[PDB]
Amino acid sequence: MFQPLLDAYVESASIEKMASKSPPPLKIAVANWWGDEEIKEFKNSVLYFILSQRYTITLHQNPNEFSDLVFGNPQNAKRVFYTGENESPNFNLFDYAIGFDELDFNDRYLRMPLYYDRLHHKAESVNDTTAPYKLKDNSLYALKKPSHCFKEKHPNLCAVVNDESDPLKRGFASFVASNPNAPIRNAFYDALNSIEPVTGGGSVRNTLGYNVKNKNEFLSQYKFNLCFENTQGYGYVTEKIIDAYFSHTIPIYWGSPSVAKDFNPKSFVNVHDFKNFDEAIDYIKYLHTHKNAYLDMLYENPLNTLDGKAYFYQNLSFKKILAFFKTILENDTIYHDN
Amino acid sequence: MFQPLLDAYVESASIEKMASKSPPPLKIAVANWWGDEEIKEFKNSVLYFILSQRYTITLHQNPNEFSDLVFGNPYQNAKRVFYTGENESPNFNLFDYAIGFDELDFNDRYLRMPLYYDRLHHKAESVNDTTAPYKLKDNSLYALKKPSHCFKEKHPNLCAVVNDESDPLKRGFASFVASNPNAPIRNAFYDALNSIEPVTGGGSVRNTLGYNVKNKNEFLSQYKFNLCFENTQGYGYVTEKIIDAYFSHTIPIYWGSPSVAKDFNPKSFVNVHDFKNFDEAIDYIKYLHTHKNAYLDMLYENPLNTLDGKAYFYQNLSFKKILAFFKTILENDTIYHDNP
Numbered sequence: 001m002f003q004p005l006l007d008a009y010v011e012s013a014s015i016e017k018m019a020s021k022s023p024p025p026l027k028i029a030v031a032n033w034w035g036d037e038e039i040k041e042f043k044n045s046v047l048y049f050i051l052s053q054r055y056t057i058t059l060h061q062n063p064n065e066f067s068d069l070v071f072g073n074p075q076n077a078k079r080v081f082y083t084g085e086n087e088s089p090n091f092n093l094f095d096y097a098i099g100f101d102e103l104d105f106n107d108r109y110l111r112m113p114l115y116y117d118r119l120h121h122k123a124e125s126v127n128d129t130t131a132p133y134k135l136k137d138n139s140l141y142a143l144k145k146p147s148h149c150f151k152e153k154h155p156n157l158c159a160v161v162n163d164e165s166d167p168l169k170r171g172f173a174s175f176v177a178s179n180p181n182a183p184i185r186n187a188f189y190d191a192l193n194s195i196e197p198v199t200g201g202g203s204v205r206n207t208l209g210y211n212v213k214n215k216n217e218f219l220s221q222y223k224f225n226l227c228f229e230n231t232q233g234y235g236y237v238t239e240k241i242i243d244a245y246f247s248h249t250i251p252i253y254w255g256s257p258s259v260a261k262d263f264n265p266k267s268f269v270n271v272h273d274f275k276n277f278d279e280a281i282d283y284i285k286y287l288h289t290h291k292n293a294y295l296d297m298l299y300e301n302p303l304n305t306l307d308g309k310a311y312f313y314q315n316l317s318f319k320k321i322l323a324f325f326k327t328i329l330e331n332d333t334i335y336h337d338n
Numbered sequence: 339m340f341q342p343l344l345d346a347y348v349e350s351a352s353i354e355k356m357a358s359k360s361p362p363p364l365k366i367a368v369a370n371w372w373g374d375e376e377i378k379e380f381k382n383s384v385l386y387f388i389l390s391q392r393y394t395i396t397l398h399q400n401p402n403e404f405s406d407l408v409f410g411n412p413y414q415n416a417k418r419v420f421y422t423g424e425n426e427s428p429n430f431n432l433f434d435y436a437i438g439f440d441e442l443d444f445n446d447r448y449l450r451m452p453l454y455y456d457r458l459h460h461k462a463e464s465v466n467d468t469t470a471p472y473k474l475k476d477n478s479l480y481a482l483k484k485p486s487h488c489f490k491e492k493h494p495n496l497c498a499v500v501n502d503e504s505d506p507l508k509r510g511f512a513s514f515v516a517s518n519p520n521a522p523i524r525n526a527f528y529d530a531l532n533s534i535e536p537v538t539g540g541g542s543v544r545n546t547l548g549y550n551v552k553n554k555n556e557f558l559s560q561y562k563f564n565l566c567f568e569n570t571q572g573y574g575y576v577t578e579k580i581i582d583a584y585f586s587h588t589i590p591i592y593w594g595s596p597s598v599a600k601d602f603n604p605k606s607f608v609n610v611h612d613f614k615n616f617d618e619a620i621d622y623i624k625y626l627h628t629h630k631n632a633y634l635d636m637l638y639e640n641p642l643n644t645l646d647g648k649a650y651f652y653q654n655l656s657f658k659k660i661l662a663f664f665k666t667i668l669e670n671d672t673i674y675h676d677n678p
């Protein structure tokens with residue numbers, strides 16, 4: 001059930017109106033080592049989107065220009081590490097870091113997992129008069145003019161979410177991957193598949209004869225999505241689980257062993273809860289054969305709830321991110337090695 | 339006043355006596371380049387001392403041998419522990435666990451054990467001496483070994499001043515002992531202070547004696563203050579330097595970790611970090627040097643902060659905390675380091 005997750009995401013993007021104030025100029029340098037696609041990804045990231053709400057940003061790649069912040073990956077400006085990879089920050093080289101790790105380094109570190117950036121993208125994609133997911137009226141993501149292509153590009157997804165189709169009436173499980181360098185994921189696919197065919201839409205263990213173009217639509221045509229990170233890391237939860245929720249399919253998840261902190265464990269199969277893959281496949285078989293249990297899981301809120309409110313772990317929100325950067329900007333300390 | 343610091347350190351070293359000499363084996367891999375001298379030094383470090391209280395330690399320097407832990411900061415897939423004397427944060431991609439100076443919490447993966455604690459271990463050992471002016475509680479751990487008798491002979495001036503046989507006011511102004519020249523802020527501050535009041539240099543940097551002092555602690559005891567600067571700034575980076583000051587019965591003029599007040603009672607030393615510039619700090623040093631009362635108030639303060647009268651090490655650093663950290667490491671089978 002993606003709608004409640006979207007609802008919470010939208011709330012988490014709520015910030016105070018500053019009418020009398022005007023977004024001051026903020027100059028951000030990105031390291032030269034950064035290639036063009038990496039610069040375009042950063043400009044399109046939720047982090048950039050959030051900061052553009054409070055600052056008039058100029059992004060550039062000139063080391064001779066004095067900047068407010070400099071973003072990199074492994075000068076006397078404040079350096080900020082930000083990556084999508086399963087890589088812990090080097091604090092000798094970077095003054096501040098944004099990542100997935102479950103670590104507390106006071107003002108020097110902020111946890112903002114890639115799933116939050118994937119939610120940003122889903123939210124914008126749903127500002128469409130034909131989308132099956134609703135954005136609260138007049139909220140930030142409802143501000144831009146909507147598109148009208150959603151239903152056309154995701155027919156089966158709209159249909160199942162729109163209750164015009166039966167969720168039980170679908171294929172077994174999808175697997176979309178093109179990075180082959182992930183043994184555990186490759187081996188769980190082989191395992192599961194030898195018990196029930198699993199459909200492959202990416203370069204890896206491909207079964208279609210081509211590589212799916214719309215992962216979203218493709219996942220909506222199956223009851224489950226084999227949802228493995230490329231490696232294990234505590235707190236390392238990427239876009240993958242978000243793609244499963246959004247596509248209205250049960251995620252069979254592996255990657256971050258602490259993923260239950262981030263998402264409602266009743267809403268997905270957590271392979272980390274089992275002692276071996278066999279026991280996990282035993283639970284996956286059960287769900288596929290017990291319609292109630294299957295539907296119960298598919299209708300759970302993807303988020304955990306506390307004090308009557310669904311919540312993102314450690315209250316990840318636009319305000320948390322903005323406060324983290326306001327503290328960086330106001331502090332003159334340079335922590336990196338010189 | 340080193341005595342109360344030594345008293346807290348000794349209590350922090352209190353743990354239960356191992357039941358009947360059946361200490362399980364612990365194999366630790368260390369630097370392959372280490373010679374017998376670095377090995378000797380390691381076998382005498384506080385971490386080794388603490389672990390030897392609960393394990394029978396074997397050190398490994400052969401790369402083709404299995405170990406329970408792989409230490410240091412030079413065995414890709416072993417249980418790796420980062421530990422360095424440098425002002426360097428851990429690479430948690432490469433190391434499963436780390437011990438350092440950073441004020442960071444990474445749950446079971448990180449423990450803060452500043453070098454100052456290891457320096458205290460060495461001072462404690464050196465005062466298990468029948469001629470020392472500092473006392474180790476009876477029958478406690480550092481008093482269990484046989485005591486030496488050379489302390490006073492090597493630290494006459496130090497013993498005199500601590501033994502109340504010398505006047506602390508009747509001493510030179512300030513000592514500076516450094517041989518690592520690559521320390522801008524430090525070298526410059528000496529120049530700043532020396533230009534107002536001569537500072538005696540005992541190391542290779544800004545040396546004024548004509549030779550390098552052999553016993554740092556005896557030398558520092560002959561001056562009212564000790565210019566005690568770290569080589570670089572780092573939050574939590576407090577090394578053996580400030581301990582050497584306390585031990586020498588002289589007031590540390592400190593700069594290094596901006597948060598040093600968490601570790602030590604700020605009424606016991608001059609925290610250069612508390613001033614917007616160096617002039618202001620030397621103006622405060624100038625004042626202490628010329629107001630006997632304020633000077634003696636500072637020299638007599640407990641080096642440690644206290645809570646409800648009880649002195650404490652910041653975050654309760656202790657042999658128990660360190661042993662618990664290692665017991666968790668040893669019993670946890672999760673591999674955290676990048677697994678190729």
Ligand SMILES: Nc1nc2c(ncn2[C@@H]2O[C@H](COP(=O)(O)OP(=O)(O)O)[C@@H](O)[C@H]2O)c(=O)[nH]1
Pocket residue numbers: 176177178179180201202203211212213214215229230239240243
């Ligand atoms: N539409 C589509 N998406 C894909 C394909 N292959 C992988 N993806 C998705 O793109 C993202 C990157 O997956 P991948 O390339 O395997 O690198 P990974 O992040 O290391 O697993 C994941 O969310 C995949 O599900 C494909 O062939 N088509």
Ligand SMILES: Nc1nc2c(ncn2[C@@H]2O[C@H](COP(=O)(O)OP(=O)(O)O)[C@@H](O)[C@H]2O)c(=O)[nH]1
Pocket residue numbers: 515516517518519521540541542550551552553554568569578579582
């Ligand atoms: N006895 C003695 N101690 C020294 C001498 N030079 C430095 N030290 C001490 O050795 C330690 C390291 O000093 P140093 O070589 O400058 O490396 P640093 O850690 O960067 O300051 C400090 O505690 C110094 O005070 C010296 O010439 N004689």
